[PDB]
Amino acid sequence: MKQIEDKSEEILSKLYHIENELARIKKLLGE
Amino acid sequence: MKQIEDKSEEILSKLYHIENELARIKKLLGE
Amino acid sequence: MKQIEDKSEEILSKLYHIENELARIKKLLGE
Amino acid sequence: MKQIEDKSEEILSKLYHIENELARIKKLLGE
Ligand SMILES: [Cl-]
Ligand SMILES: [Cl-]
Structure with missing residues (x-):
């Protein structure tokens, strides 16, 4: 179909979108 | 099919549902 | 197929499995 | 098909890939 x-x-x-949200969380916590 | x-x-x-969970996690993280 | x-x-x-990992993170941060 | x-x-x-990201996030969170 x-x-x-x-x-x-x-x-x-x-x-x-989910992978990008998680990437963002990972970046933020790494700081 | x-x-x-x-x-x-x-x-x-x-x-x-995963997006709602990430919405909550983000709030908890101060993000 | x-x-x-x-x-x-x-x-x-x-x-x-992903929803459960996130649920777990959400619980842990809520504490 | x-x-x-x-x-x-x-x-x-x-x-x-999302699971690898959650693996890293979990380590960062002390979980
Ligand atoms: Cl649908
Ligand atoms: Cl496959």
Whole structure:
């Protein structure tokens, strides 16, 4: 489905947002 | 194809839940 | 595919592991 | 079906990356 496509794209996209939040927390605590 | 898509929706829901958890953690950390 | 099935199951499974790690961090910082 | 599966593998890889980030965060937090 192009339905699974779109959901797969959002999923990736939140996953990069989560990795960035964690990277940010890691940076901040390292200071 | 439908169990897969049902699965994707489920996966996205858990990401939202992880985002709520990170929202709380960020507040606790003074960030 | 029963291939997408298995990957979908592991994906969920790491997602519950991540939610539990974060829950744990949230608990610990709340103390 | 193959782009979806290629997608799943990608998604799992990002979860592993989030787990490495949480491993580091946990060490920083004294946990
Ligand atoms: Cl959805
Ligand atoms: Cl894989």
